Amino acid sequence: ETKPQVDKNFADKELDYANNKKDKGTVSASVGDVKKYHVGTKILKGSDYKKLIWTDSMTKGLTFNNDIAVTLDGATLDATNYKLVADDQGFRLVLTDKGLEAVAKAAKTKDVEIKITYSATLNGSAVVEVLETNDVKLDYGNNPTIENEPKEGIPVDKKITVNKTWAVDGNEVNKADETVDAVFTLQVKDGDKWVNVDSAKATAATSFKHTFENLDNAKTYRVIERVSGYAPEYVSFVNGVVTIKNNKDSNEPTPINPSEPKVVTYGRKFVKTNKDGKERLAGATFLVKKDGKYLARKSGVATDAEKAAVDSTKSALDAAVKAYNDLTKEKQEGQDGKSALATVSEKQKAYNDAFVKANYSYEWVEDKNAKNVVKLISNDKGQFEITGLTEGQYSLEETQAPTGYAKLSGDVSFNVNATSYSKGSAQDIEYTQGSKTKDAQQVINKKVT
């Protein structure tokens, strides 16, 4: 029992080295919320490790905030003590010779604690009711090990292909029953920044290939591997192929792998209908409100192009909305209104899609006329919805009634909880007619008198 002890949790939850794989629960959050983490590593007296490597691999809905700070027995350990390879969904932190010696020197008289703190942002790629999580592991051992650097390159015919093999003690391994945790992240150079654009996982120690498609031949990319047990050797990047060999020494220890807390976000579906419920209504427009403030969106970590698509899709939506609003009432009540609203709902979908691709964050604003405020618009089946909200009570504030129907007499309260999106509430109706799944809150409209 000379092994390092490692635990990870949210910063506000105490570490427990003796119970480091306990259930750490699921917490509710809103998209845009920041979760703070700490990872502790206890190195026992007399340890002389020549390799200490922490890898955290996060799910797609968590953006790693690249804000690592490291301490050794409480005192700051600066960046001369480690080498960090960060991407938008995690990192690999490797102690340098200097860092390793500092740890060994400290440990010769007592147990020492390394603490690594950082945060992630819950982003707009999160899927309602589907758990998000980080995952840290510590690779360690007594032998100096060369750290190979990821290679950059370009696509060929809009493709980059990873060619992967596995070896133990220099002997190739092809074992479909041996689980591994390798993640291959494709990043693009965007200005002075590396931005994650795609990813692929290998789940067994088998010869493996994956082809990233739809790439830009004029742009520069890199593939970064996050993996434990094995370590990557970036052999070559030529002719649109990245060749990687994973190496492991059989005499080295298994990585330490603590459990992690989970993060989740929730939603609600609605259907706008007339009084008797037999007609579902398009064009009903709503703000989303929490404590008198209004839901709004901003881009997260994304490429310039992804952020620019938010603005161009918004312009198209605005134009479609104006085209409908400028129609006469008789045209709005007829075929030209229905087709115009169909176009609005198409542009609304594209705008929402662009914000999701830009990894959006929510914010709450006091001004309901802010350019970036969320407006939900009922489609031809009366449908609209909201996702990415922490559990609690909210309201819809109507900004436009469907043509020929009266303005609602007040705000429409709704509740978000662990199954509000998938199962809904007692008095719900069907989001899609004839589904036999009553999962949408009915919002009743009355005709103008």
Q: Say whether residue 424 binds K ion (CB under 5 A).
A: yes
DSSP state of 268: E
C-beta closer to K ion: residue 33 or 428: 428
> What does DSSP say about strands 412-416 and 441-444: parallel, antiparallel, or unpaired?
unpaired
Q: Is the dihedral of CA 269, 273, 275, 277 positive or negative?
A: negative
Write the interaction track for K ion spanning residues 23-42; mark x where CB under 5 A is met and - where it is not. --------------------
Q: Say whether residue 139 binds K ion (CB under 5 A).
A: no
For K ion, which residue of 7, 33, 225, 428 counts as binding (CB under 5 A)?
A: 428
The CA radius of gyration of the chain, in Å to the nearest whole number, is: 26
**Closest approach of K ion to the CB of residue 417, in Å:** 12
Task: DSSP for 275-301, please give it.
Answer: SSSS-B-S--EEEEEETTEEEEEE--S
Compute the distance between CA of residue 329 and CA of residue 4 in angstroms, rounded to an integer: 73
**Closest approach of K ion to the CB of residue 414, in Å:** 13
**Closest approach of K ion to the CB of residue 62, in Å:** 14
**Closest approach of K ion to the CB of residue 240, in Å:** 34
The helices-and-strands tally (H runs, E runs) of the chain is 4, 31
Q: Which residue of this chain has its Cβ atom nearest to K ion in the complex?
A: 424
80 token code pair: 């001369």
Q: Say whether residue 257 binds K ion (CB under 5 A).
A: yes
Contact 102, 38 (CB under 8 A): no
Q: Say whether residue 7 binds K ion (CB under 5 A).
A: no
Stretch that binds K ion, among 9-17, 285-293, 408-416, 436-444 (CB under 5 A): 436-444
Size of the chain in residues: 449
Q: How many chain residues bind K ion (CB under 5 A)?
A: 5
Stretch that binds K ion, among 71-79, 176-184, 224-232, 422-430 (CB under 5 A): 422-430
Contact 378, 272 (CB under 8 A): yes
**Closest approach of K ion to the CB of residue 259, in Å:** 6
Contact 310, 408 (CB under 8 A): no
C-beta closer to K ion: residue 56 or 306: 56
C-beta closer to K ion: residue 37 or 194: 37
Compute the distance between CA of residue 255 and CA of residue 244 in angstroms, rounded to an integer: 21
C-beta closer to K ion: residue 236 or 419: 419
CA 134 to chain centre: 10
Compute the distance between CA of residue 409 and CA of residue 389 in angstroms, rounded to an integer: 25
For K ion, which residue of 3, 159, 314, 438 counts as binding (CB under 5 A)?
A: 438
Cα dihedral: 176, 182, 188, 194 (round 10): 180
**Closest approach of K ion to the CB of residue 257, in Å:** 5
C-beta closer to K ion: residue 33 or 135: 135
Task: DSSP for 165-188, please give it.
Answer: EEEETTEEE-EEEEEEEEEEEEEE
**Closest approach of K ion to the CB of residue 6, in Å:** 9
**Closest approach of K ion to the CB of residue 47, in Å:** 21
C-beta closer to K ion: residue 181 or 398: 181
**Closest approach of K ion to the CB of residue 355, in Å:** 28
C-beta closer to K ion: residue 40 or 424: 424
Task: DSSP for 110-170, please give it.
Answer: S-EEEEEEEEEEE-TT--TT--EE--EEEEEESS----PPP-EE--BTTBEEEEEEEEETT
Give residues 96-135 in contact with K ion (rule: CB under 5 A): 135
Stretch that binds K ion, among 84-92, 241-249, 344-352, 430-438 (CB under 5 A): 430-438
C-beta closer to K ion: residue 139 or 428: 428
Q: Say whether residue 262 binds K ion (CB under 5 A).
A: no
First to last CA, the chain: 80
C-beta closer to K ion: residue 363 or 385: 385
Site for K ion, rule CB under 5 A: 135, 257, 424, 428, 438
